[PDB]
């Protein structure tokens, strides 16, 4: 009965975790000084970094060349760690002082509350029947603005704090404030949804011990099918334990209905941590190197390190022969104590000044270095994992419908046309942590996150949809994934703004074929 409260201390008060984050943030804040593009100190608050992020986006859009966009795309990915780090350092600071797990998690709720609408859709519902049909994202404002008219085409807008605070305010209003600060980052969103689930049932998991709890580091450490059986113990699911079939079949034959949608984000992410665990194995295969997904995780860490260095001892990957097999790179790190392989001083040093210069094979040996370590309950690889792009890119592989982009958008409308009748006067005003998220909070939240027209600078759709239809001449959403001509461009286009990934996460979760009559994860 002790391992409910004990495992939360890894989430909340692990001093090894607090030591590793301050290692990361001291690296980040020294890396923001040494930028050739151009600053918060360490003791700044979270609402500083939110107000600092939009300053960098107001600094990065205006100085956006095509020539400096490596320095820009890092200094966007740097900040969406440093915003998450100064969010992740909220309980670790408070538990170190107050030594209470309840009041520590209160310091998360006291941030996201920030203690201090019916007319829109009635204009929309008349607008649909006048349409009723691809002319909804193609309204007259989009006739001026075509593929890459200005620097604004890749970002949100033309660097307005007032625009970027509207997306701050709307996701705060419609219960989706957790998503918008974090991105769809497979770990930071998963970590902070478990903590969102921690206060939601603090009497059930804790002080009554009736429902078994797990840290987010532990659920990553299990096997592929063992994650969902661990997740079913987390929520109040009941099912047959041994399922011969896939998870995506036997989950549906239980009638999962009236489920907490905090639990349905985690079932999404474990479904896309599984499909991230495969796509690092499926793409890194060479000779004398055959990894498997259900392999024991102390052996994947053993086999992968015995592959790139012939000694099975954990070596530095960035100096072995195998990491340099694709292309000869140089071997620079200043501390050349044996240097351990999962070092934050090391892994952040190559991500700053060599990660743009990597091919496709050298890229994957960074993420396979940080897919292992996640599988071994390493806090160092956990803290390493926040600044990798690859945990953001798992929502890129989500798109598998062969329908057009407008037929995914009609299913977003088709939710709202049902959601408009389903108003029971449940008022979401601040993204709390005690609260649930309803489906109306998710369908209205994403649609108002997409179509935000401010100063006639076009919305998130009208930059993305124009990039698909008139920029890549693509009619079918599933053709983004096949044909590496399309895709290697498409993962450069999205990776300007993290909020594209936050858009697609909000757009994938909301544009299902069957979201109209069933749940999200169903």
């Amino acid at each position: 009965d002790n391992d409910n409260i004990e495992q939360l201390k890894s989430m909340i008060g692990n001093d090894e975790l607090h030591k590793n984050l301050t290692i990361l943030e001291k690296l980040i804040l020294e890396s923001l000084e040494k930028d050739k593009l151009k600053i918060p100190t360490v003791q700044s608050t979270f609402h500083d970094i939110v107000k600092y992020e939009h300053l960098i986006k107001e600094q990065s859009i205006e100085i956006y060349n095509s020539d400096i966009s490596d320095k820009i795309k890092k200094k966007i990915f740097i900040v969406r760690t440093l915003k998450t780090i100064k969010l992740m350092l909220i309980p670790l600071n408070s538990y170190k002082q107050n030594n209470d797990l309840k009041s520590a998690l209160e310091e998360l709720n006291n941030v996201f509350t920030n203690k201090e609408h019916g007319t829109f859709f009635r204009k929309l519902l008349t607008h649909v029947r006048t349409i009723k049909n691809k002319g909804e994202t193609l309204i007259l404002g989009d006739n001026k603005i075509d593929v890459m008219n200005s620097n604004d085409f890749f970002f949100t807008t033309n660097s307005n704090v007032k625009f970027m605070e509207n997306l701050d305010d709307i996701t705060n209003q419609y219960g989706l404030g957790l998503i918008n600060h974090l991105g769809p980052h497979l770990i930071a969103l998963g970590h902070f949804t478990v903590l969102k689930l921690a206060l939601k049932n603090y009497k059930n998991y804790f002080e009554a011990k009736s429902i078994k709890f797990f840290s987010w580091q532990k659920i990553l450490e299990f096997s592929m099918s063992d994650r969902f059986k661990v997740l079913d113990m987390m929520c109040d699911h009941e099912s047959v334990y041994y399922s011969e079939k896939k998870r995506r079949k036997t989950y549906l034959k239980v009638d999962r209905s009236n489920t907490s949608m905090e639990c349905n984000i985690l079932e999404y992410l474990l479904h896309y941590f599984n499909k991230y665990q495969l796509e690092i194995i499926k793409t890194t295969q060479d000779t004398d190197f055959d990894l498997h997904g259900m392999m024991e995780h102390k052996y994947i860490k053993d086999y992968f390190f015995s592959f790139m260095c012939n000694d099975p001892k954990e070596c530095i990957i960035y100096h072995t022969n195998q990491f340099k097999k694709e292309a000869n790179e140089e071997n620079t790190f200043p501390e050349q104590r044996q240097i351990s392989a999962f070092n934050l001083y090391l892994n952040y040093y190559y991500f700053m000044k060599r990660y743009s210069s990597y091919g496709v094979k050298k890229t994957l040996y960074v993420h396979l270095l940080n897919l292992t370590g996640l599988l071994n309950y390493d806090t160092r690889a956990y803290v390493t994992s926040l600044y990798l792009p690859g945990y953001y890119n798992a929502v890129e592989m989500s798109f598998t419908e062969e329908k057009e982009f407008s037929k995914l958008f009609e299913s977003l409308i088709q939710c709202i046309e049902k959601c408009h009748s389903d108003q029971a006067r449940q008022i979401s005003k601040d993204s709390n942590l005690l609260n649930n998220i309803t489906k109306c909070d998710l369908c209205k939240g994403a649609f108002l996150y997409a179509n935000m027209k401010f100063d006639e600078v076009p919305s998130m759709l009208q930059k993305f949809y124009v990039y698909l239809t008139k920029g890549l001449k693509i009619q079918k959403v599933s053709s983004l994934i096949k044909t590496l001509d399309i895709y290697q461009d498409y993962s450069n286009y999205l990776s300007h703004d993290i909020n594209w990934y936050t858009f697609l996460f909000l757009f994938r979760l909301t544009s299902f074929k069957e979201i109209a009559k069933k749940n999200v994860a169903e």
């Binding site: 096997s223 059986k229 079913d232 041994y242």
Partner: protein
Amino acid sequence: KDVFAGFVTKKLKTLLDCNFALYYNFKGNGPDAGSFLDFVDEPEQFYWFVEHFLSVKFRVPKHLKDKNIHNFTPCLNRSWVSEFLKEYEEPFVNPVMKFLDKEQRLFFTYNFGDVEPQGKYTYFPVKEFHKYCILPPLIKTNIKDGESGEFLKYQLNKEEYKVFLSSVGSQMTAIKNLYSTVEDEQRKQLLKVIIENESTNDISVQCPTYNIKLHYTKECANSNNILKCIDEFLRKTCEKKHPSADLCEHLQFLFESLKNPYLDNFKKFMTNSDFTLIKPQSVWNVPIFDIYKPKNYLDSVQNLDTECFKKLNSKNLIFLSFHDDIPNNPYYNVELQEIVKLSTYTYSIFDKLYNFFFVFKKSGAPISPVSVKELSHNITDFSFKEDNSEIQCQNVRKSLDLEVDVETMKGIAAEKLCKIIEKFILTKDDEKSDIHRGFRILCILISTHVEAYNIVRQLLNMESMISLTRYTSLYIHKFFKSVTLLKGNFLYKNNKAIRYSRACSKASLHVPSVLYRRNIYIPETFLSLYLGLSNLVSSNPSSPFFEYAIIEFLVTYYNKGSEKFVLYFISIISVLYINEYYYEQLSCFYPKEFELIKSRMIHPNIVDRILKGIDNLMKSTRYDKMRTMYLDFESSDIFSREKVFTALYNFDSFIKTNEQLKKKNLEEISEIPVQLETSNDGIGYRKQDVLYETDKPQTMDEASYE
């Protein structure tokens, strides 16, 4: 205790008339006319009906359950023979045959009227004769229509085939010679697209099979060979209504086309009894016939007729030829089943485990599967099983040597398992005896040791990739399916060895299935010991659910009433002992070679937490029915670490003894028949055709396409 007088009680006929009603309706299409078995004339059709229907207890299959035909419900859990031997004193076989044929023909006439019932025939495939085609052949191409998904398919006719034979040139010239003769534009366009696409697309001439249907025991009783038998069949038909009336038309049609030499020797063939037209195209191996059990009737890839009872195998091919010879090979001989009593014929078949289903329905309770909430409370620790300690040498004994070749290890494992059957038959010579307790553990462990011995050899890079033995139990499964019919063994025509042979065949099927489970998520093959097991239960041995996941997988076979429950529970426990075995052998004695496989195996202390965990979970209140049903059909030898290792230390010391007699070759297992070089006399393959295609050079006119 009544002497059998032909009278039947009410109870037996209700079992008996039902046993027809399953078998005639086994397709589900209804009663079938081809399903008749003549009991009186052919005994082998009778004893087959004894085995799959009469001797075993009755049971309605799943696909018959939706059909809902004549009332099975008073007569489900009862067998016909065990009632029949209990009520009546043991008769000779001949009054039984008249008794059951009398009931059957009344059942047939009640369902089919005045149709004369015929015996279920024995099929013989004949494709090609003397490397010519015995029927109008078929042309297969790689051309594809745009109108249809299917390729171009041109089937020749009889009058076209005369021109197809008289062409001196190759097969390519023969179709070109055909194109003048053919008179339909829907055929000529269909032949034009074939000939036009010759240089870009394949064209091959493939013959159809003709099947020689005959009553086996009635015809082949007096003849020396099956090769001799069909000759005495065909001479009855050419001189002469039997359903081989097609073939003797086709011979006289084709030998009319093959004008002077081949018509005379065929006309001479009906006179001289020394002549054999039937000659083996392939080197024959065991089995001679494949005897089709009723499951094979349902498989759509087989596409069997109802009238198939024995087919000459794909391993064994017959081609009609005048010139060629018959080699010396003992499997040409007619082998007839011994007419044995109804008593002894059941006990050579009767296996205790195949009544697992009836113990479960009567005296077994269905176990509820584990709900994940109840799984949370029943476990205390969620820490991972982790041990990386190096094993102390002094407790273990080196029985493992890796220098022994894998294809020899196939031979040693068959030879060692022939000796265990040899000891179980002879030493227990003393009427309702079962298989001994140690069997189905010795069948599985010894096959599991050699199955892992592949994976150890393929990881060590020591086996040649030219001949990688994929599944070694496949060598075990094909061997013990046909070990009694195989020469050179002590088990040759040993009726006590049959149920020991069929059991080790089916038990070794479940061995590589555990070691090779492709995951539902990742579709790759792999060289690991535990990755097979981990994909089966969808959990890892480091994970704390692994104890529950093994047993909860066995709950899936248990609640179905499946006989496979006992076979799997032997298998998964045996795989864990294997991982203890090699990791104790390699870490002490092959310390270089241990380093490459140390990630592919499990540390044995990690296996012990599983095995101490499983044995406690079997005694739990949810799983008490699991342990008791296993011990009814097996002994608790597999629970001991020590007696199992001595069963492996016996086999791995058996190699050090029997390395003298490793010289014996592996008995062949492939479905593909062994080649026999025949005299080249085909259309493409005459000596005349070699000189004709050299007579015309490659003309520049045709390569211009004009």
